[PDB]
Write a protein that binds this ligand. Sequence first.
Ligand SMILES: OC[C@H]1O[C@@H](O)[C@H](O)[C@@H](O)[C@@H]1O[C@@H]1O[C@H](CO[C@H]2OC[C@@H](O)[C@H](O)[C@H]2O)[C@@H](O[C@@H]2O[C@H](CO[C@H]3OC[C@@H](O)[C@H](O)[C@H]3O)[C@@H](O[C@@H]3O[C@H](CO[C@H]4OC[C@@H](O)[C@H](O)[C@H]4O)[C@@H](O)[C@H](O)[C@H]3O)[C@H](O)[C@H]2O)[C@H](O)[C@H]1O
Ligand SMILES: OC[C@H]1O[C@@H](O)[C@H](O)[C@@H](O)[C@@H]1O[C@@H]1O[C@H](CO[C@H]2OC[C@@H](O)[C@H](O)[C@H]2O)[C@@H](O[C@@H]2O[C@H](CO[C@H]3OC[C@@H](O)[C@H](O)[C@H]3O)[C@@H](O[C@@H]3O[C@H](CO[C@H]4OC[C@@H](O)[C@H](O)[C@H]4O)[C@@H](O)[C@H](O)[C@H]3O)[C@H](O)[C@H]2O)[C@H](O)[C@H]1O
Ligand SMILES: *[C@@H]1O[C@H](CO)[C@@H](O[C@@H]2O[C@H](CO)[C@@H](O)[C@H](O)[C@H]2NC(C)=O)[C@H](O)[C@H]1NC(C)=O
Ligand SMILES: *[C@@H]1O[C@H](CO)[C@@H](O[C@@H]2O[C@H](CO)[C@@H](O)[C@H](O)[C@H]2NC(C)=O)[C@H](O)[C@H]1NC(C)=O
Ligand SMILES: O[C@@H]1[C@@H](O)[C@H](O)O[C@H](CO[C@H]2OC[C@@H](O)[C@H](O)[C@H]2O)[C@H]1O
Ligand SMILES: O[C@@H]1[C@@H](O)[C@H](O)O[C@H](CO[C@H]2OC[C@@H](O)[C@H](O)[C@H]2O)[C@H]1O
Ligand SMILES: *[C@@H]1O[C@H](CO)[C@@H](O)[C@H](O)[C@H]1NC(C)=O
Ligand SMILES: *[C@@H]1O[C@H](CO)[C@@H](O)[C@H](O)[C@H]1NC(C)=O
Ligand SMILES: *[C@@H]1O[C@H](CO)[C@@H](O)[C@H](O)[C@H]1NC(C)=O
Ligand SMILES: *[C@@H]1O[C@H](CO)[C@@H](O)[C@H](O)[C@H]1NC(C)=O
Ligand SMILES: *[C@@H]1O[C@H](CO)[C@@H](O)[C@H](O)[C@H]1NC(C)=O
Ligand SMILES: *[C@@H]1O[C@H](CO)[C@@H](O)[C@H](O)[C@H]1NC(C)=O
Ligand SMILES: *[C@@H]1O[C@H](CO)[C@@H](O)[C@H](O)[C@H]1NC(C)=O
Ligand SMILES: *[C@@H]1O[C@H](CO)[C@@H](O)[C@H](O)[C@H]1NC(C)=O
Ligand SMILES: *[C@@H]1O[C@H](CO)[C@@H](O)[C@H](O)[C@H]1NC(C)=O
Ligand SMILES: *[C@@H]1O[C@H](CO)[C@@H](O)[C@H](O)[C@H]1NC(C)=O
Ligand SMILES: *[C@@H]1O[C@H](CO)[C@@H](O)[C@H](O)[C@H]1NC(C)=O
Ligand SMILES: *[C@@H]1O[C@H](CO)[C@@H](O)[C@H](O)[C@H]1NC(C)=O
Ligand SMILES: [Ca+2]
Ligand SMILES: [Ca+2]
Lengths: 755, 755
Amino acid sequence: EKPRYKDPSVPVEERVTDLLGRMTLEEKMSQLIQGDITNWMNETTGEFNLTGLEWSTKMRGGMFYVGYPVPWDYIADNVKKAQDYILQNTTLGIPAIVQTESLHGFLIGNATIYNSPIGFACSFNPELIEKMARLIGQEASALGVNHVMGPVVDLARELRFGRVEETYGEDPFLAGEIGYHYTKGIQSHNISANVKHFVGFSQPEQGLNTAPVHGGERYLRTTWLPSFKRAIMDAGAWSIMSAYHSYDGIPAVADYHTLTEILREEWGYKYWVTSDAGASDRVCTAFKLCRADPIDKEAVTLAILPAGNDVEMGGGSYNFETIIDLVNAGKLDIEIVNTAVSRVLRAKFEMGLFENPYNAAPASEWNKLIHTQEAVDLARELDRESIVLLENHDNALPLKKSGSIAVIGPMAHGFMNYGDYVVYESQYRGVTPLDGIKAAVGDKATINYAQGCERWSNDQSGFAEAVEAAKKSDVAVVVVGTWSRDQKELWAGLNATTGAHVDVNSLSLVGAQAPLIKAIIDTGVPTVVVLSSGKPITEPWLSNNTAALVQQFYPSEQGGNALADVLFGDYNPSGKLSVSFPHSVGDLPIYYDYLNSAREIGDAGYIYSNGTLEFGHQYALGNPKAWYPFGYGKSYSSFEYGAVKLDKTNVTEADTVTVSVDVKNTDATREGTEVVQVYVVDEVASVVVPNRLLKGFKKVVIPAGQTKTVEIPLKVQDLGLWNVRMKYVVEPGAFGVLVGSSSEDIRGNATFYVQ
Amino acid sequence: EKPRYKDPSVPVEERVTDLLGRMTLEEKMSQLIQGDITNWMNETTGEFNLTGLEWSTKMRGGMFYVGYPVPWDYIADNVKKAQDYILQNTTLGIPAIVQTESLHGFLIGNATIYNSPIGFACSFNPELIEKMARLIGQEASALGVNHVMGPVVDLARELRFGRVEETYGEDPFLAGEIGYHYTKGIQSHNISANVKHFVGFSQPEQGLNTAPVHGGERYLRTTWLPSFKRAIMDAGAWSIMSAYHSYDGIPAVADYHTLTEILREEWGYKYWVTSDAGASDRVCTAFKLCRADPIDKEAVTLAILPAGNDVEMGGGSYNFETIIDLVNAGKLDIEIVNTAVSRVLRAKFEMGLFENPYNAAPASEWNKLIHTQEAVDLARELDRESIVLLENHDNALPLKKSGSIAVIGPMAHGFMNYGDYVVYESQYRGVTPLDGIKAAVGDKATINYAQGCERWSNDQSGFAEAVEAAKKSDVAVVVVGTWSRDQKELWAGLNATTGAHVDVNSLSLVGAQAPLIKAIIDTGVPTVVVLSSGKPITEPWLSNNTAALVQQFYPSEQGGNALADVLFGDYNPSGKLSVSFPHSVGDLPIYYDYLNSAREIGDAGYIYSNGTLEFGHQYALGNPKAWYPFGYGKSYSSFEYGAVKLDKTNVTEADTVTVSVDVKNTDATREGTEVVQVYVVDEVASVVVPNRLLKGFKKVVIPAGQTKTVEIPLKVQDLGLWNVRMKYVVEPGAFGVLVGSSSEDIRGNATFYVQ
Ligand SMILES: OC[C@H]1O[C@@H](O)[C@H](O)[C@@H](O)[C@@H]1O[C@@H]1O[C@H](CO[C@H]2OC[C@@H](O)[C@H](O)[C@H]2O)[C@@H](O[C@@H]2O[C@H](CO[C@H]3OC[C@@H](O)[C@H](O)[C@H]3O)[C@@H](O[C@@H]3O[C@H](CO[C@H]4OC[C@@H](O)[C@H](O)[C@H]4O)[C@@H](O)[C@H](O)[C@H]3O)[C@H](O)[C@H]2O)[C@H](O)[C@H]1O
Ligand SMILES: OC[C@H]1O[C@@H](O)[C@H](O)[C@@H](O)[C@@H]1O[C@@H]1O[C@H](CO[C@H]2OC[C@@H](O)[C@H](O)[C@H]2O)[C@@H](O[C@@H]2O[C@H](CO[C@H]3OC[C@@H](O)[C@H](O)[C@H]3O)[C@@H](O[C@@H]3O[C@H](CO[C@H]4OC[C@@H](O)[C@H](O)[C@H]4O)[C@@H](O)[C@H](O)[C@H]3O)[C@H](O)[C@H]2O)[C@H](O)[C@H]1O
Ligand SMILES: *[C@@H]1O[C@H](CO)[C@@H](O[C@@H]2O[C@H](CO)[C@@H](O)[C@H](O)[C@H]2NC(C)=O)[C@H](O)[C@H]1NC(C)=O
Ligand SMILES: *[C@@H]1O[C@H](CO)[C@@H](O[C@@H]2O[C@H](CO)[C@@H](O)[C@H](O)[C@H]2NC(C)=O)[C@H](O)[C@H]1NC(C)=O
Ligand SMILES: O[C@@H]1[C@@H](O)[C@H](O)O[C@H](CO[C@H]2OC[C@@H](O)[C@H](O)[C@H]2O)[C@H]1O
Ligand SMILES: O[C@@H]1[C@@H](O)[C@H](O)O[C@H](CO[C@H]2OC[C@@H](O)[C@H](O)[C@H]2O)[C@H]1O
Ligand SMILES: *[C@@H]1O[C@H](CO)[C@@H](O)[C@H](O)[C@H]1NC(C)=O
Ligand SMILES: *[C@@H]1O[C@H](CO)[C@@H](O)[C@H](O)[C@H]1NC(C)=O
Ligand SMILES: *[C@@H]1O[C@H](CO)[C@@H](O)[C@H](O)[C@H]1NC(C)=O
Ligand SMILES: *[C@@H]1O[C@H](CO)[C@@H](O)[C@H](O)[C@H]1NC(C)=O
Ligand SMILES: *[C@@H]1O[C@H](CO)[C@@H](O)[C@H](O)[C@H]1NC(C)=O
Ligand SMILES: *[C@@H]1O[C@H](CO)[C@@H](O)[C@H](O)[C@H]1NC(C)=O
Ligand SMILES: *[C@@H]1O[C@H](CO)[C@@H](O)[C@H](O)[C@H]1NC(C)=O
Ligand SMILES: *[C@@H]1O[C@H](CO)[C@@H](O)[C@H](O)[C@H]1NC(C)=O
Ligand SMILES: *[C@@H]1O[C@H](CO)[C@@H](O)[C@H](O)[C@H]1NC(C)=O
Ligand SMILES: *[C@@H]1O[C@H](CO)[C@@H](O)[C@H](O)[C@H]1NC(C)=O
Ligand SMILES: *[C@@H]1O[C@H](CO)[C@@H](O)[C@H](O)[C@H]1NC(C)=O
Ligand SMILES: *[C@@H]1O[C@H](CO)[C@@H](O)[C@H](O)[C@H]1NC(C)=O
Ligand SMILES: [Ca+2]
Ligand SMILES: [Ca+2]
């Protein structure tokens, strides 16, 4: 007599079948459309509108967005009102999924802000990233959130595109490892991850946000899909978000081959796909696959729902409201609707929502769960591990805590240089470089600060003050780079050089920043430049014209403390680049995993700083090789690698090859951390393959003078290619194993053979 | 009793069967490998080596290259020796194909040099290009050549790549029309064309010569293949050359899908495919599909010959010498060899070579066939029709033949600015801008010449002389641009900014050229800039800071006379751009036929010349829209278009729609020529398609005040797409017809509907 779907002990598929058979067609439509908390919650006052909750639950009640910059109790209270309404005032009581952003911290004011993804990928520390994700899930779940819109497992393969910072770099393997760990950390709370943006999104034409992508099926399977497969199938993500683009002319939101044939029929994915925000309308408005004005809502629904895009996100025209009419007209098979709903319900059952619909903590516990010291300490630790040392001439770094230090530049103080996907007014809280350097030295050194310039201006009126600061100091630290905006300022249109919908046609420093550096170097004071940015910057004259060069991708709220830890030697920098740096925007793309036959062609030309021209061929007056390659990063210590050893030389597809190498820290006094990287070369292939691929790594702490044996496993099944019949095969033959300190700095090699 | 293959009256397929059944395996191998005239001809002395001819005919005798910078009689005599040896000293007497380059003129000294392809495509005059090709074939056949290595029907879709100049622009339709006409003109002589480079070659990664191409099958079929289909199938080209690249990871030289499934099984191509020069070795050396050192010649042959690449070009390791061993070992089916040989023989029979093996004229007739006044006049006419007027402020142009005129700049005099694929020392003959301007004015104007700068230097020591020339003149013409090299200097490594193996990471003027222009403008003398180049140049400040701006892609030997014809008003410029011009190399790609959802996104930023920054989004500080779009070009006259009329509004796939529009020349006095362009929009599609596509045009001469009715046919069968099943369909629905003066300057529109 009680419904079987309410029984926690019944197998999930039986619960899904029982619930689906009780649902009206309107109740099915409602599970597939995303609502919004502001449908019942006034964003300024927090005041409740029942009529709005009734409508939202009826028409778009399966899940709703909560990413507004409001007090914690507005979110907790109005989420509770929604879950209570569902239980008391609907027949079936299907609990809502409650969605927000988490990219590099729970998107609510005064929560912990971690460094941006492109930066924490430079840690090469997926276990530390899993701890971050567990703390983000702790913070989110405290307020009643049960779904976060991450990770991004897109690859940074088009450096003009504004969302490079949101990715884990250009490499499929590193992005897949980080996405697996991030997904696992979030879902350890029974909160759903949302792997995005499926698939092939982040190589837009011209670098423009949402522009179409040129590519074939071999590139899609070889490069784009692996990070998705690691986060979705291996970590068991409960949801996916499809993308805005077309890939070889098929919209991602309407691609049956990717969303159904690969994702379900090949991989066996069990759960649901949502569109991106207004991605449904784009089928007509951007792609012209239907009438745009007025929008053909039926045509949108008939394109995307049968393709395998189960859920329509807000931000569009709510085209799926046509489902009732389409099923009643015989234009849409009820089985397609039932499959979509089943996917959403399956995730909600497995998450535990029917047994625990509202997971918020009481108000008295929020300060014990959100912005804890454990989370702030982890923010500092992970930021510190992400900093990449690019140059260090004649032991300029680390700095002594003595004498006088100039701290110069627009990114040194006055605002926090956060990446995108932070809440409004975040930039007014956190540790700046100046704050961290002043705290580090105390009364032992004099700090001479000068802004030098505004990041958004070519005005040089601040230079004389900065030159005076440098001249009165023993060393100068100059902090410059790119900037983004928070989730109100970005969409209001305030100036930026990176972030969603902020694309660039140049990677050089903007405004007076490069001339500011030149003015300080020209004092003859040793000058340490810190790049504070969301993507590569092209200024190759910095490598040999400064005393040291440090990369800190957009910081955590502890950014200046992490930076001072490295600058003063309390931490030996250990980061390695997650993305290759070109010499110029004219040299793109620059990824390290180019196909054999790319990049290494001919001789490069050069333009001397005095204007002399030295003509070459690839290019006439420039260089297509990376300025700094994927995996690059220096240390205050030096590392010497021994002979590479394999445990097995003659293997099957079924085998694991363990790579062993002894690494010695040859420094006289300082412990350091090395990221040992393993690149695999498929020496002879039946189709053209990537020249080399990262397939393992290990980050190892090595005391001064000590030797550590580093072991890295290679699963042979993971080393295959997509052959001329579009089948995945590990072909018999030789595989080279290249071991070293970057994708170019190879210190040893070995070979094994697949039979 | 006499062999059937010798009977001219026997059907070609019976001749092929009879000859093939008489051939040894070595004789079959020899038809599939390209020899070289220098195997028997000393390039310096012309002296004959019989032993060399015997070997070359035995091992690689089907065809041979003759592109060396030698006297006419060296070519004629040593070709005759080869054809005579074949007839007297081989069993079967299979006549040789005799190959050279023809791109923009027969590649031998003192033959007619036409303007480069990217330039003559701006004529939008395929009938005039067919007359050029007929004259190139007259010149080549005079010396015993029977095969030319063109046309290039690649598209200029990557502006960094050095071979943009060799193409007919970025548009499939225009490139297909020109390639059809060029092929037809050559083959009217019973000389074979060689359509190249099949397929998808000219979008290399990073812009680098021979680098791999990312793209899908829909892009390949939609954009890359159509120009090939027009030149190959509609004009009946007797040969094709495959390319150096990989496309989505399949080498073009080893692609069974393109070379066999599309080219033969879909299209029904009857003839042969050659590799490019050393393209066979690349299967191992660049693509790593086999051992490189020592080269696995068997593996190369097993990859490319069965794929459909019949003939191995010289410049590699002559891998096909393994055919005998491979057939004898049972590794290569004799039927694959027999099919390849049959394709070569079929072309040789159809050409008429067995009846006429040596087509050279006698020496007494060479000056009546090569470099005739008819050919030189056509060179001037076609060059003049190719010049594009970009700007003309306040009737600066045309110039009067009075007063004083300054002629300034590195490209104004001292060398001819020819494109690539000219013979060694060509640059010392032809009409420079200065030569043409001095000839035009005679004693009616004073010409003040100054070089101003060297194209390859930032030295400004010549500026004072040029400023003095400008100040003493009423108007200044400044000639700058890019440069290439001839077929000895290019491969010797001399400096260049365009041409095969000369790729660039910037499109801005090189060296002191832009500062030279600024120095002349700053005199206050009206300044007319002529861009003399092989591809777009990015200098947007020229549009509104000069008096006039003229584009002349690399000239003919009559270049300065054609330029003076336009500058002084004897010809009203009529060219339209074959390729879109971006604002910056950071904005690429820039083709006009982008897919719906590309390019038109968001708001553009700007950097003022005073350094003020104006932030946008696409891009933060730049503009992804073209500076000048495909099809752009001004006139001294103005044109007013009437209403667009269609003869039929309701059509089938079988129908032709004729577009009619009245065009009036509204100038007070001057006749002018307009290129009326017709763009088709498929308003609603089942897959994402190009936003608009050129599908017809007509170049029309209109006297001042006159109205002409222009009629352009559209074959509805040509307006389809490649659907989600990769089938070509013309889908029922609306097609917009946009008529105008460029791809952006649309003056009228109409709609028809397919049933
Ligand atoms: O109306 C124009 C303009 O008016 C001004 O008055 C106002 O200041 C602007 O806000 C406004 O623009 C719209 O703003 C919102 C964000 O609004 C905040 O600012 C005002 C505050 O008062 C308010 O509290 C805030 O809500 C933008 O939202 C962003 O939308 C993008 C997608 O939209 C962009 O990208 C695609 C392109 O096609 C569009 O034209 C472009 O604008 C999101 O991008 C995807 O979003 C999802 C998250 O979705 C969630 O937020 C959006 C919502 O509709 C949906 O229901 C939610 O689930 C990510 O997970 C994906 O990774 C990402 O790809 C942004 O996150 C989102 O914040 C509007 O775009 C804008 O028009
Ligand atoms: O050995 C290095 C260097 O030594 C110096 O001493 C010398 O000055 C250089 O010549 C030399 O380099 C080689 O030069 C030849 C051209 O040689 C001329 O200059 C010297 C003169 O004394 C002599 O009479 C001349 O022959 C180059 O030839 C060009 O080759 C390219 C292809 O090679 C390039 O592109 C691919 C890349 O993989 C290579 O590394 C790169 O060098 C042609 O490109 C294709 O060629 C065909 C035409 O083929 C015909 O010419 C080449 C020949 O082997 C073949 O048998 C012929 O059919 C075009 O139709 C295609 O469109 C194009 O894609 C050039 O046309 C060709 O002139 C050598 O590359 C170079 O190594
Ligand atoms: C970029 O945005 C900043 C705001 O972040 C603008 O800064 C304001 O500029 C005016 C005059 O330029 C000042 O009086 C305000 O005090 C500025 N605010 C801050 C926080 O500095 C800046 O003008 C914008 N720049 C451009 C070029 O758009
Ligand atoms: C580019 O190539 C030209 C040859 O075309 C070089 O010109 C020679 O330069 C030397 C000294 O620079 C002169 O003495 C010769 O007279 C020049 N020859 C000509 C024909 O002008 C030029 O040097 C090269 N430039 C670079 C930067 O490589
Ligand atoms: O200061 C450390 C040294 O102690 C260690 O021995 O070498 C490191 C690497 O320095 C090289 O790479 C960076 C360049 O900028 C240097 O000039 C090189 O010696 C240093 O950080
Ligand atoms: O000189 C002719 C005029 O006679 C004709 O009337 O307009 C033409 C086009 O000029 C426009 O386009 C080019 C820009 O540079 C001008 O400023 C525009 O008026 C002229 O060539
Ligand atoms: C939210 O509250 C304020 C009143 O204090 C109001 O100005 C605004 O209109 C309200 N928003 C909505 C959509 O009712
Ligand atoms: C309350 O919500 C209903 C239904 O969406 C809406 O019509 C009404 O305008 C809302 N009132 C306020 C004050 O926002
Ligand atoms: C249920 O709806 C009734 C109005 O019909 C309302 O009085 C009651 O507060 C609602 N309860 C919840 C928990 O939403
Ligand atoms: C959390 O999710 C797992 C996996 O579906 C499930 O087994 C478990 O019961 C869930 N826990 C709760 C408390 O709902
Ligand atoms: C800086 O110096 C070293 C010279 O030892 C060199 O390897 C590197 O290429 C130089 N970097 C740049 C950007 O010029
Ligand atoms: C510029 O620097 C180069 C390289 O050191 C040198 O060869 C050249 O002579 C210098 N040029 C000038 C014009 O000073
Ligand atoms: C061609 O002739 C000249 C002799 O005048 C000679 O120097 C050169 O070696 C000859 N070439 C060959 C390959 O024999
Ligand atoms: C003549 O050709 C033969 C065969 O290729 C070659 O061995 C011999 O060296 C050549 N002699 C000259 C003078 O080039
Ligand atoms: C044929 O070969 C013989 C040498 O065996 C030679 O004497 C004769 O000149 C050759 N004839 C021709 C036309 O090549
Ligand atoms: C020229 O080619 C055509 C087409 O194959 C052929 O019909 C004709 O006989 C040829 N003419 C000569 C003189 O060989
Ligand atoms: C030149 O001037 C006209 C202003 O009427 C404008 O259309 C064009 O955009 C300007 N060109 C550039 C390159 O600024
Ligand atoms: C630069 O030009 C802009 C645009 O005319 C003007 O707004 C700005 O005031 C000028 N800037 C300076 C610093 O002169
Ligand atoms: Ca292999
Ligand atoms: Ca249509």
